[PDB]
């Protein structure tokens with residue numbers, strides 16, 4: 494007896510009514526820019542499948558970021574490209590400025606707009622209550638947009654949210670794990686960073702959807718308002734679910750498992766133990782209380798739910814009273 498099927502309760506059939514070309518990334522034909530337009534300046538970091546450089550566009554002296562892709566399935570590169578082109582211009586979505594390659598070796602690279610980021614390990618220490626509300630709202634705009642365009646990000650975490658704080662400018666980056674949502678599809682659960690993996694991933698429930706990103710977002714919120722990063726700190730994927738259970742409680746976890754007829758690894762129920770659901774107020778201390786409000790705790794509570802169908806959508810989240818003062822500020826006459 495296998496697990497009960499599931500489908501997204503929003504944007505379920507966005508890709509269904511799109512032209513095949515929209516989601517059939519395998520058939521996408523890349524339009525290549527010119528490699529010689531860019532000069533590498535400094536290495537910023539290294540992914541498992543890429544190397545990331547600060548660069549300059551020499552035709553206009555603008556800073557950019559160049560991500561050189563290591564040898565990998567072309568299918569994976571084409572998926573990231575198609576997704577970035579589909580979402581280009583969307584609110585707080587990183588802009589893919591160009592796609593280039595060594596014309597002889599064919600080694601390809603993605604070129605992005607530059608964000609003058611403050612590393613989150615430094616920045617979050619200094620964020621005010623209003624700053625958190627504001628940037629959470631910006632992330633929600635990006636997620637509602639990509640979800641409405643039929644795409645799951647699947648790697649929401651502080652490292653993938655670039656913030657130029659003095660310009661109050663936020664971009665959601667690294668779309669390398671993102672995928673098109675098709676109802677009934679069984680997806681790879683090996684996505685997202687350990688600390689931001691939703692319960693569905695940790696229990697190997699493959700028929701997940703956009704709501705995975707809302708779990709990850711709730712993990713970020715908790716880490717910001719409680720000044721504990723990451724909030725759920727497991728030592729491996731099994732222990733990650735234990736850390737969640739110690740806060741959300743084991744009864745609601747086993748209710749979730751039961752509802753979807755999920756078969757848990759035998760090892761789990763010995764390490765999961767029995768835990769009451771904790772009040773979110775328990776994590777409020779003198780040092781973080783200026784970032785916590787009844788509205789913050791109510792909002793967080795509505796994101797961090799075992800049942801993916803029970804989590805707020807990005808659109809529902811933007812309606813929450815937590816964002817009242819932010820929404821007025823955004824109401825811009827310009």
Ligand SMILES: N#C/C(=C/c1c[nH]c2ccccc12)c1n[nH]c(N)c1C#N
Nearest residue numbers: 528544559561563593594595600601602
């Ligand atoms: N240096 C160097 C490399 C340069 C490039 C290869 N394509 C590119 C496309 C646009 C801009 C630079 C390169 C490189 N090629 N292959 C790697 N793994 C590299 C590294 N680092």
Ligand SMILES: N#C/C(=C\c1c[nH]c2ccccc12)c1n[nH]c(N)c1C#N
Nearest residue numbers: 537545558587605606607608609610666
């Ligand atoms: N890593 C990475 C990326 C950006 C940065 C990493 N450290 C930084 C330090 C200062 C300024 C920008 C970055 C990045 N990855 N993908 C993109 N589109 C990016 C942009 N911008």
